[PDB]
Design a protein around this ligand. Structure first.
Ligand SMILES: CC(=O)SCCNC(=O)CCNC(=O)[C@H](O)C(C)(C)COP(=O)(O)OP(=O)(O)OC[C@H]1O[C@@H](n2cnc3c(N)ncnc32)[C@H](O)[C@@H]1OP(=O)(O)O
Lengths: 73, 430, 122, 508, 73, 64
């Protein structure tokens, strides 16, 4: 209960953590994906901040890096 | 004076043996009880102390029952509801030779003009007696047929509200088991009409809604919605529909599939209608009411009495000391007073025991001690009351002259005639 | 009980010779305490003594402190003196340091609202 | 609208109107394009579509939040269009499921941002398909799937459905603009269809009635010169703040977010040439038609408290359908039935249960109570109670009703209370009228408690054919519930003010 | 000066009661009501009028020609 | 009665002066009935009434 009380500050730190874990590296292993999946299933609205950003990662690491297109073209 | 209490013979730590059923029952059978159907004696208990229930106006408006009784030896007035069918006998007028006696049908769980008039009269009488009130509600609503709209049912429907709003004693509404309060009957006995005194409770096997299941089904579950439900439940419908929408088959096969779909849509209706009825009944539950905050608690029938004693007694005792506070400072409202009593209680008992407020037995004992004890612990509650009275008198004198300075010179002099010499020195020097 | 009475923060108002100071006190750990005074934050390493006193490290020097609550006074004894208030780096130690701080944040031991997020990002 | 990351293109359109009436229909539109090579489906093509659409949808929602909250134009129906350029081999049912999940997971935000419609173009195998989605409150998504048919003799393309639920777009060409009235000229028609006036038409009639009153009592009395219709009236709307207190606001009509409206009017009457203040209250028949919710009851209560404080009359214009009912819609969709025999449903059913997959995404909202059970080797959440996350459909409207009931009971005994019945009044809305005790009724209206349909169902035959058999003027005026009958609302208002002509300006 | 008024019928009236469609053996009836006489409904009306007029804050005028209350069955 | 009630800045309503006198006497009787029934506040009652009185009235209070 004591840990759940400060969940907003925990959410801020979690956003800062996710910013540096799956940022400028469009790739995800079979371990990060499970954590992100469980984290996106936090349907309680107080944790929405940590769910939403997590979904971004789940969709963000499937994009071209501009290196393939630039080199080939 | 207060209502007189007895050292009754019928206990408070017993349970209710007679249990309301879904089939018809005489509501008296749940107030006083009934003899054992299988023995020659052995009274099956009811809600109140045995032999204490006393009826009035029995043959009038038989769909409703009213009386007086005792709970733990605490006198109460009672209002209950007929679920059996009654037949109303009207005589002929000898002033008209073409007149005839008639027998009208009157279904239970339903208000009629006369039943509502009776309920209103009973409420007013019981209140002016100075009694608390118990109400066992199993009303589905008000009759809407031509006769009853002609015979003025809205009028007494509104008079019920007018009566309940003016009650000065506890009113406890309880929805028994296998009972349901629907809409028009909620809005006339809701606790929000007089929250200082009115309380509502519901069994686990009770129902409340703004409407029954069938009337809601008829509006929310139309044929098209039942069909959309068939679309994802019935394997036969699913097979035929997945096939009919499968492109590039043929014309005749599509025709056959469409006809089979129509046949199944007409066939399955009663079962999906009952499904809709149960999906309607699933949100007429009392847990939803507790969560929404429209009942104070969810009770078991059998133990009910032992609850309603200690609550009721507590309230009575509270109504005493609160009255004294209202006598001390008449300008204090009732929330202020409940909060004040909380404050006094935690101050004198301590914050560790602040949880002993929602414990009706212990708090009633404490209030009984503080009010009924004299030449003893000397009632710190009484000293607090005296202080509030003192402050009120002071504030009143000062508000009086602050609004009327012209009498100040006449006010001082008389107060210099009954004061000490040292107080006189303090008056002169300051 | 609801989860907003189990708080990790206390506002303490102490009046010294007419000057009222409103201080905030929370924790970053079971033994790491944070005090806001005059709008400035300070961390103190606090250990509980069996005799009711506290062993404090505030500015590098250690202190043994006691408190006595009166009807309208707070008598705070430090060493042999009393104050009465009226009642109205190597790249691998840094890793462990900041990791313990962040884990404490994850377990619910967080800085106060006006100072939080200014040190955690670092 | 300028925005960072200039691959999203956001627009705010103001509907074209003539040189008379101003613009009321404003709409945010989002247009984005999706660039990638064609997909070779090996059960691995969901990711591109889902991720790209969801990324663009999130960016669109963010920019929509910023633009909508930074301005004041009152948009109603925001729309989104995503064009999936590359080709994918995928059955339309799988596309339905994927877009359903992707949209439902943010339906709450899309509802908050007033996003009601969406259009998604996907090339199949390539034949373009169009997904037209209607996204109302975030529990159900009305998905309509169409293919483009180019088999024509001209350059014209057609929408053609898939047999199941043809919908409105069947035979719509390919490219049609939009515009609506969005308020104030569809609610007028919606009310006039039922035999009453739109609520914000109340004051004008009020003013007009007073003009006739300043004729009427001039044949009784040597009155002063009458005032101008501009000076004959002046009113201030009473709105609710975020706390539940009344704010004295001056704003344009149509801005009610609830089904109740309240005005404080000052006017000049032949009896008091300088000063006459009243409170008027009205139900909006167009907003979830009639029904009383908690905020409607709140506005009623605060308005009556104001009138009692100042000591001035209260008038209530009733056009309602009773208390609001409903059912947890999400649960109404995601529930399954455990038959006694799955192959013969007429042998009975044992219970209604949820699966864990859909249970785990609702239960944190306090919308339902279920019990775990193990049956047929399957783990199941048998439903026991359904609560609903939506506020204003449950027993809380009973608590509200009695509250305002008491207020009426009080208001009768402290100030003047008058009630007017225009279209209908059911349940509480009937009792409220009777608690005012000065009831005016309109012809072709009814005060009822139970419906003719329900009574006939319990009775088993067509006893009653109209509800005016139960609560009409042939019942309510001949029994003493209504004091006066009238043909319309203007006559009712003139009657109200005539009655006030006999009464003091205040209790003091 | 505004007043509320209560007066009394001396003519005969005929009270029309309809039939209830819920009962197929029901019939409409015409009852006779002589003036200068109280009936239950006439007295109820008089009471309601008194209360309403009083709570309006009006004076009251009463033109009484009542012979009494009906005593029939 | 119409003249005596509706006239202001005129004959000045001797009826109104009588009404003011009755109000004065009522307030006086009320204060005195209050403290006569509750002497325990008398010392608290006097002091506040020595804060908004003239110096000559203060002399009369001290001497009498
Ligand atoms: C006051 C009490 O405590 S009990 C009263 C509680 N409410 C009721 O009893 C409702 C009474 N029943 C009715 O709604 C009446 O039949 C009517 C006339 C008001 C509505 O019937 P209709 O003329 O068929 O209108 P309809 O039912 O279509 O209403 C429009 C929609 O709003 C919904 N709706 C209708 N009445 C209500 C209501 N009282 N509360 C909430 N929603 C409602 C319906 O689902 C309906 O759905 P649809 O448009 O998809 O068909």
């Amino acid at each position: 209960i004591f840990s759940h009380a400060q969940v907003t500050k925990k959410n801020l730190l979690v956003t800062m953590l996710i910013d540096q874990l799956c940022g400028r590296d469009p790739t995800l292993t079979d371990e990060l994906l499970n954590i992100l999946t469980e984290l996106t299933q936090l349907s309680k609205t107080t944790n929405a901040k940590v769910a939403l950003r997590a979904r971004q990662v789940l969709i963000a690491s499937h994009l071209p890096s501009y290196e393939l297109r630039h080199n080939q073209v | 004076s207060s209502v007189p209490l007895l050292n009754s013979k019928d206990p408070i730590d017993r349970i209710i043996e007679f249990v309301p059923t879904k089939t018809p029952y005489d509501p008296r059978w749940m107030l006083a009880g009934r003899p054992h159907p299988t023995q020659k004696g052995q009274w099956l208990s009811g809600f109140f102390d045995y032999g204490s229930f006393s009826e009035i106006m029995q043959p009038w408006a038989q769909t409703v029952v009213v009386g007086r009784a005792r709970l733990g030896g605490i006198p109460v007035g009672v209002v209950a509801v007929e679920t059996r069918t009654v037949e109303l006998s009207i005589p002929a007028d000898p002033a008209n030779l073409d007149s005839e006696a008639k027998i009208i049908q009157q279904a239970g769980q339903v208000w009629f003009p006369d039943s509502a008039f009776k309920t209103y009269q009973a409420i007013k009488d019981f209140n002016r007696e100075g009694l608390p009130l118990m109400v066992f509600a199993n009303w589905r609503g008000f009759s809407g047929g031509m006769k009853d709209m002609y015979d003025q049912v809205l009028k007494f429907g509104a008079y019920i509200v007018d009566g309940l709003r003016e009650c000065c004693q506890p009113v406890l509404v309880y929805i028994p088991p296998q009972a349901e309060l629907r809409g028009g009957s909620w809005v006339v006995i809701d606790s929000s009409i007089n929250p200082r005194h009115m309380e509502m409770y519901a069994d686990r096997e009770s129902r409340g809604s703004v409407l029954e299941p069938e009337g809601t089904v008829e509006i929310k579950f139309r044929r098209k919605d039942l069909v959309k439900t068939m679309r994802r439940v019935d394997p036969v419908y699913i097979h035929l529909a997945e096939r009919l929408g499968t492109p590039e088959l043929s014309t005749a096969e599509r025709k056959e599939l469409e006809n089979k779909l129509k046949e199944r849509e007409e066939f399955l209706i009663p079962i999906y209608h009952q499904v809709a009825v149960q999906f309607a009944d699933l949100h007429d539950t009392p847990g939803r009411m507790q969560e929404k905050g429209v009942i104070s608690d969810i009770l078991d029938w059998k133990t009910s009495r032992t609850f309603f004693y200690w609550r009721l007694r507590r309230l009575l005792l509270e109504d005493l000391v609160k009255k004294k506070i209202h006598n001390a400072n008449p300008e204090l409202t009732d929330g202020q007073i409940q909060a004040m009593l909380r404050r006094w209680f935690v101050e004198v008992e301590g914050t560790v025991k602040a949880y002993v407020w929602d414990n009706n037995k212990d708090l009633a004992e404490w209030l009984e001690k503080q009010l009924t004890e004299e030449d003893g612990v000397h009632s710190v509650i009484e000293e607090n009351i005296k202080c509030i009275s003192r402050d009120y008198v002071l504030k009143q004198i000062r508000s009086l002259v602050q609004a009327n300075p012209e009498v100040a010179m006449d006010s001082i002099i008389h107060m210099t005639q009954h004061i000490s010499p040292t107080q006189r020195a303090e008056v002169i020097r300051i | 009980l609801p989860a907003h009475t189990l708080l990790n923060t206390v506002d303490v108002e102490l009046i010294y010779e007419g000057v009222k100071y409103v201080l905030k006190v929370t924790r970053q750990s079971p033994n790491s305490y944070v005090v806001i005074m005059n709008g400035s934050c300070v961390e103190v390493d606090v250990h509980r003594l069996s005799d009711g006193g506290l062993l404090l490290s505030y500015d590098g020097s250690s202190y043994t402190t006691y408190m006595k609550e009166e009807v309208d006074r707070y008598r705070i004894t430090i060493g042999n003196k009393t104050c009465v208030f009226e009642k109205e780096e190597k790249l691998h130690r840094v890793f462990h340091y900041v990791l313990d701080n962040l884990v404490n944040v994850m377990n619910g031991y967080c800085l106060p609202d006006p100072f939080f997020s200014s040190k955690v990002k670092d | 609208i300028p925005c960072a990351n200039h691959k999203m293109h956001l627009y705010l359109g103001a509907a074209k109107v003539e040189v008379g009436t101003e613009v009321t229909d404003y709409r945010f539109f989002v247009r984005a394009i999706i660039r990638h090579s064609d997909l070779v489906t090996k059960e691995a093509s969901f990711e591109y579509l889902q991720n790209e659409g969801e990324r663009l949808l999130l960016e669109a929602m963010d920019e929509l939040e910023v633009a909508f909250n930074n301005t004041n134009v009152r948009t109603d129906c925001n729309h989104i269009f995503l064009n999936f350029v590359p080709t994918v081999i995928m059955d339309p049912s799988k596309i339905e499921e994927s877009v359903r999940s992707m949209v439902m997971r943010y339906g709450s935000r899309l509802w908050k941002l007033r996003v009601l419609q969406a259009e998604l173009k996907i090339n199949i195998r390539a034949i373009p398909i169009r997904l037209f989605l209607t996204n109302e409150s975030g529990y159900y998504l009305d998905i309509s799937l169409y293919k483009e048919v180019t088999d024509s003799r001209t350059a014209q393309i057609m929408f053609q459905a898939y047999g199941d639920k043809q919908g409105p777009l069947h035979g719509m060409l390919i490219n049609t603009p939009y515009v609506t009235k969005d308020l104030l000229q569809s609610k007028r028609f919606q009310a006039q269809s039922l035999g009453t006036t739109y609520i914000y038409d109340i004051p004008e009639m009020f003013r007009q009635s007073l003009i006739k009153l300043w004729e009427s009592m001039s044949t009784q009395a040597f009155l002063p010169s009458p005032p101008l219709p501009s000076d004959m009236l002046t009113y201030t709307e009473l709105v609710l703040d975020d706390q539940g207190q009344l704010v004295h606001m001056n704003r344009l009509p149509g801005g009610n977010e609830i089904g109740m409206v309240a005005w404080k009017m000052t006017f000049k009457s032949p009896e008091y040439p300088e000063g006459r203040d009243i409170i008027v209250i009205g139900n909006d028949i167009t907003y979830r038609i009639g029904s009383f919710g908690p905020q409607e009851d709140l506005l009623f209560l605060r308005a009556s408290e104001l009138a009692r404080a100042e000591g001035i009359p209260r008038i209530y214009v009733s056009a309602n359908s009773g208390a609001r009912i409903g059912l947890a819609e999400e649960i109404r969709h995601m529930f399954h039935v455990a038959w006694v025999d799955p192959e013969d449903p007429y042998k009975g059913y044992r219970y209604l249960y949820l699966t864990p997959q859909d249970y785990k995404r609702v239960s944190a909202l306090n919308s339902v109570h279920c019990e775990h059970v193990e049956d047929e080797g399957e783990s199941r959440y048998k439903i026991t109670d359904i609560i609903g996350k939506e506020e204003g459909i449950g027993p809380e409207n009973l608590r509200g009703s009695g509250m305002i009931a008491g207020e009426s009971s009080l208001a009768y005994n402290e100030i003047i209370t008058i009630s007017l019945v225009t279209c209908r009044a059911i349940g509480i809305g009937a009792y409220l009228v009777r608690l005012g005790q000065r009831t005016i009724q309109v012809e072709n209206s009814h005060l009822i408690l139970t419906g003719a349909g329900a009574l006939n169902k319990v009775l088993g035959r067509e006893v009653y054919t109209s509800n005016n058999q139960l609560g009409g003027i042939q019942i309510m005026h001949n029994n003493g519930v209504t004091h006066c009958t009238v043909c319309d609302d203007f006559e009712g208002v003139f009657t109200v003010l005539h009655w006030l002509s006999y009464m003091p300006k205040s209790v003091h």
